Amino acid sequence: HHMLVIWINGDKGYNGLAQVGKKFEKDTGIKVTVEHPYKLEEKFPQVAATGGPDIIFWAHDRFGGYACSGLLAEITPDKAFQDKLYPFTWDAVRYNGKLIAYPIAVEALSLIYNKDLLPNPPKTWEEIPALDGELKAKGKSALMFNLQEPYFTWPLIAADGGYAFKYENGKYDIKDVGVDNAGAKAGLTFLVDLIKNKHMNADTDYSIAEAAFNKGETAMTINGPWAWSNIDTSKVNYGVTVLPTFKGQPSKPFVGVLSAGINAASPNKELAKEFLENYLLTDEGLEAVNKDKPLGAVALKSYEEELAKDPRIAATMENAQKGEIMPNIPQMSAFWYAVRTAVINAASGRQTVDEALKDAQTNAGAIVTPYTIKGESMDPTLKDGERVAVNIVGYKTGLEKGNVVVFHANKNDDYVKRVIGVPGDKVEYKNDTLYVNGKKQDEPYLNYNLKHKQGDYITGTFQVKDLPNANPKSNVIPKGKYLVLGDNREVSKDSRAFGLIDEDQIVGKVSFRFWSHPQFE
């Protein structure tokens, strides 16, 4: 209740932001604490309810997910205040008609280069192999940048046609994903070729690339405005310019708007608003942050009119113009995770580009929704109160035996049971022995219950032909129908009672974490 806690990423001007906090404290007596936890954008949903920060700073893309999860307060700037920021910046922080954060600054990646090593930066990605050859001859490299985060590789991937979700007629279509089209494949292939030919290393990360550029070991890097301070300190004579083209096409970075959201569970929402509107988003407040680590093109018109005079900001905005504003939809998290996996696997050689991007295409558009389990009839596989992630099954798409499915039982109730037979399968039980298509099928998920039973058998003999919604002449499950049973077979009310369910009732599949995995792969 007494103070404000603020989370901002470790690459941003958090010391500058703390100075703004000190000013607010001096004026108001209210203490401001600035933290930069590792992967804060992932930690925030974990803690948000269980009081998390009062204010969270991140690029706008993560906020729709947070808003959809109920974690953010609607902000309430008046007309006068809204008019002080560029209208397009407010667009980035509007979700389902409501403003869900304060925009701070526009961030786009640029090509950063060492003028002493490379007085004329390359116009094309295609030049970089030969350039690297020349620089290797003097113990340097052409290009190093963070290959572990897809943000940095995306500009090249999107150059010849890759995209995240198609925006059309006022809406993003999350069924239309552009991760495995021809342009995406060509870009990712080029990146993999660079690595194969030792022009880049698949292990290069943020710190490795930053250290290399700032020590004069590589001629070029790709980074955002927040990086410029450290380069100033290093004394490298650097330029900031337009990203090179690929196959004749501009690189297309995803453009972020650094934004500040207010935790829905904060008891300090009024103080948060005062801090953001009257201290941070002023010429003085932004200057303090900007002098620590540059923000980019700020949302506040009065200060941006000064910052826009800087050629480096002109480069930033030129690259932004070829790129695109990130979507803010909840599905963005899944997209980024899918593309991060594809880039890592393709770059390490675990998968071919075609395989990696095929999986990413699938994973980027797969909807995942949380559920809570109620009752004992799946015990011990699922427990009463257990939180699970449910993979939504597309309208009429790939259910298989063994899938644990959530389904609508009626207008008011969803149930969860295991798929034991799919359409076309012939199924019966003899005591506790499952026969599918004439062959005994082991059920390892029943092991504990089979070995801790009250009665003679936990499932017991039955045939599909005797159940509701079955074909009474056959044990072959009809088209569109599913046989579902609860793992806690002795107590479960399932298809043995209510019969086969319909494909139209199925919501999705419960995802499970397997307890074992390799120690390195």
């Binding site: 729709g64 997910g65 808003a67 959809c68 999860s69 109920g70 389902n96 909840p330 929704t369 949380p370 559920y371 809570t372 389990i373 109620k374 009752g375 004992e376 009839s377 799946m378 015990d379 699922l382 009463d384 939180r387 699970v388 449910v390 959530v406 039982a409 109730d413 969803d414 149930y415 969860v416 049971k417 609860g486 806690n488 479960s492």
Partner: peptide, 11 residues
């Protein structure tokens, strides 16, 4: 997203 409660599924 909507901001509502997490749905429940009866086991």
């Amino acid at each position: 997203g909507g901001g509502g409660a997490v749905p429940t599924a009866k086991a």
